[PDB]
Amino acid sequence: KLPPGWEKRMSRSSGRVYYFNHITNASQWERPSGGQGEPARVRCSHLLVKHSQSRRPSSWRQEQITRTQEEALELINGYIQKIKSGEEDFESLASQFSDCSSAKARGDLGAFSRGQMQKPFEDASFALRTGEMSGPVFTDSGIHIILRTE
């Protein structure tokens, strides 16, 4: 019934029902829908937070990325909450805080097909519908938030 990846869950903390995508790690309160397959190409922006265990623990923001994986996840979760609240905008946060050179393009990576990005990033990107934002996506580079723009 629900689009690919989506499952109806309940919070262990709360008792509140929500919807979770196992492929993008996205969470939301709203039901995600009221032979299509997947798009052959998508365009995505992303915000990357690296940690000490990233493949290249360095960025234009700092030579020596020393935050732990848990601290990077906490930062990612904070950005997601700020975007969902309306306090901040995705592109603005990516320009300021993404540990990837695509920050200078406000996170934009352009269009791509399967087989071009790391598999977790690719799996999440192609499970997003246009306009949707992922949850935390773990790759060898670090933790990403992904926004599908096309």
Partner: peptide, 4 residues
């Protein structure tokens, strides 16, 4: 840097 998310390229394969």
């Amino acid at each position: 840097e998310x390229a394969r």
